[PDB]
Amino acid sequence: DVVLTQTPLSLPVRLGDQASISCRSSQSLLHSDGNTYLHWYLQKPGQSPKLLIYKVSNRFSGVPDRFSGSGSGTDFTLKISRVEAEDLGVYFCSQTTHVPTFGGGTKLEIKRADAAPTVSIFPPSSEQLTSGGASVVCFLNNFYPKDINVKWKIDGSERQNGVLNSWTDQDSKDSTYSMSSTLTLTKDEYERHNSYTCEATHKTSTSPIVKSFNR
Amino acid sequence: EVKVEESGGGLVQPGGSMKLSCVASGFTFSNYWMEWVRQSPEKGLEWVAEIRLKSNNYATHYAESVKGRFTISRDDSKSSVYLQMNNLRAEDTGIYYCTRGGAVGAMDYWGQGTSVTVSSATTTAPSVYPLVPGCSDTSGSSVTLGCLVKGYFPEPVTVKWNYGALSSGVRTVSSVLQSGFYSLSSLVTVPSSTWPSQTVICNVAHPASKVDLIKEPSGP
Ligand SMILES: CO[C@@H]1O[C@@H](C)[C@H](O)[C@@H](O)[C@H]1O[C@@H]1O[C@H](CO)[C@@H](O)[C@H](O[C@@H]2O[C@@H](C)[C@H](O)[C@@H](O[C@@H]3O[C@@H](C)[C@H](O)[C@@H](O)[C@H]3O[C@@H]3O[C@@H](C)[C@H](O)[C@@H](O)[C@H]3O)[C@H]2O)[C@H]1NC(C)=O
Numbered sequence: 367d368v369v370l371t372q373t374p375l376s377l378p379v380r381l382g383d384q385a386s387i388s389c390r391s392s393q394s395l396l397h398s399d400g401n402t403y404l405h406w407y408l409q410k411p412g413q414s415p416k417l418l419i420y421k422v423s424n425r426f427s428g429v430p431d432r433f434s435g436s437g438s439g440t441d442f443t444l445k446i447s448r449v450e451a452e453d454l455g456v457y458f459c460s461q462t463t464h465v466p467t468f469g470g471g472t473k474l475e476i477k478r479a480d481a482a483p484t485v486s487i488f489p490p491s492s493e494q495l496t497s498g499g500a501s502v503v504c505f506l507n508n509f510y511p512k513d514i515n516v517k518w519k520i521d522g523s524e525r526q527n528g529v530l531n532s533w534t535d536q537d538s539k540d541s542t543y544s545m546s547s548t549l550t551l552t553k554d555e556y557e558r559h560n561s562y563t564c565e566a567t568h569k570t571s572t573s574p575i576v577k578s579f580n581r
Numbered sequence: 582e583v584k585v586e587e588s589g590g591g592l593v594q595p596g597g598s599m600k601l602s603c604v605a606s607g608f609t610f611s612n613y614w615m616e617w618v619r620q621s622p623e624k625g626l627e628w629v630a631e632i633r634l635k636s637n638n639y640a641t642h643y644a645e646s647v648k649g650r651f652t653i654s655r656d657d658s659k660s661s662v663y664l665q666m667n668n669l670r671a672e673d674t675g676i677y678y679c680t681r682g683g684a685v686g687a688m689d690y691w692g693q694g695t696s697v698t699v700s701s702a703t704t705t706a707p708s709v710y711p712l713v714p715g716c717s718d719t720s721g722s723s724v725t726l727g728c729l730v731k732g733y734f735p736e737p738v739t740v741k742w743n744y745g746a747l748s749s750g751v752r753t754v755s756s757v758l759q760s761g762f763y764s765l766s767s768l769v770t771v772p773s774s775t776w777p778s779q780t781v782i783c784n785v786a787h788p789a790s791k792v793d794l795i796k797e798p799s800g801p
Pocket residue numbers: 397401403462463464465466612613614616631634642681682683684685686687688
């Protein structure tokens with residue numbers, strides 16, 4: 367079919383700054399009726415995609431002037447002057463001149479001022495014990511950039527086995543991430559120790575943010 | 582005000598059947614072509630099928646990868662479009678969206694989507710545990726609480742707090758697949774005094790098992 371390649375794959379941009387996503391097709395999109403059916407869509411986190419530009423340069427209902435679309439042969443581009451908080455998400459380019467195909471997508475990420483994480487630690491709930499395993503969670507809230515290092519210490523000794531880290535998307539309102547580190551032991555393993563510590567190391571601090579609890 | 586809504590998703594075998602339903606409202610439904618586009622994690626957005634108007638004998642067009650297995654029908658009287666899918670396979674896994682064939686030459690309005698998973702693995706409703714402080718000194722915004730969702734399959738599960746009434750500062754990480762099972766956690770930060778004098782509850786939903794789980798974090 368007709369392949370639509372988009373670049374860059376991921377794109378950082380400061381608020382109020384400009385951003386350009388390009389889309390190149392494997393073939394000419396000019397339709398016999400002289401129309402080029404090349405569109406761009408935005409899919410915010412956890413949402414259905416939305417039409418921004420249709421037919422290369424037309425903006426759809428409610429779309430701000432901030433969005434501009436151009437084209438030249440097989441190369442097309444979406445421009446966003448005055449970028450802002452709500453513009454984060456993935457942008458797609460599609461074509462309906464032939465059998466509808468879509469572009470790989472481009473994750474627009476908001477580049478903002480560093481933010482210090484806010485650590486919270488939750489001991490397992492007695493409700494989990496009967497499953498034969500215990501999960502201790504360390505939540506790193508509202509921080510920027512994405513990158514973060516979490517290390518667990520059980521009775522002093524650093525632990526690595528049984529950890530699982532997962533991030534959230536960028537927040538639409540303040541552009542920060544959140545992240546949880548979950549340590550899962552077996553019921554008994556967890557009962558053979560008493561002090562559980564987790565140390566977080568971010569860019570915003572030399573000294574690790576440390577949160578801990580004892581039974 | 583255009584609003585489309587899909588439904589009828591869940592887990593199937595390799596190789597069963599399943600019918601999707603889409604209900605549109607907010608426009609003269611009979612005047613537009615209707616579409617179906619699935620979004621796989623492995624193959625991004627993929628146009629599946631299209632159905633046209635009545636004056637068009639209700640012509641249909643399918644994506645090569647589904648010709649013969651899928652069938653798209655419509656009911657202008659009910660403002661609905663359907664997608665009968667037979668002989669399902671791993672590859673058909675993905676979120677299915679029902680969009681409109683816009684006057685402007687582009688699928689202008691989409692539904693929120695309804696997930697479809699083909700697998701020989703069986704359903705498992707999630708287990709939900711509470712995330713409560715852990716008895717400490719107030720030094721972290723003003724009180725963070727959460728729900729840990731483990732051992733469920735397939736995806737996804739949507740977590741809402743206080744039936745959605747509570748929607749500020751809600752943070753839900755991404756789900757992770759491990760040991761054949763997913764899990765994630767959702768948290769909210771409330772003021773030191775609104776809890777526990779007032780009640781907070783998470784609403785965990787898991788479409789595949791058709792279960793809706795309600796749990797309230799008291800301060801134990
Ligand atoms: C293989 O290439 C395709 O098939 C060939 C046989 C054909 O010669 C070639 O032109 C290609 O045509 C496309 O065919 C596929 C299915 O095989 C369709 O899915 C394409 O439809 C596009 O995407 C739709 C979402 C969109 O609604 C279509 O746009 C309509 O048709 C074009 C021609 C009009 O310019 C546009 O205004 C729109 O038609 C209006 O609105 C619709 C809702 C209404 O039913 C119409 O009566 C009219 O008022 C199209 O972009 C198809 N591509 C095209 C460009 O038609």
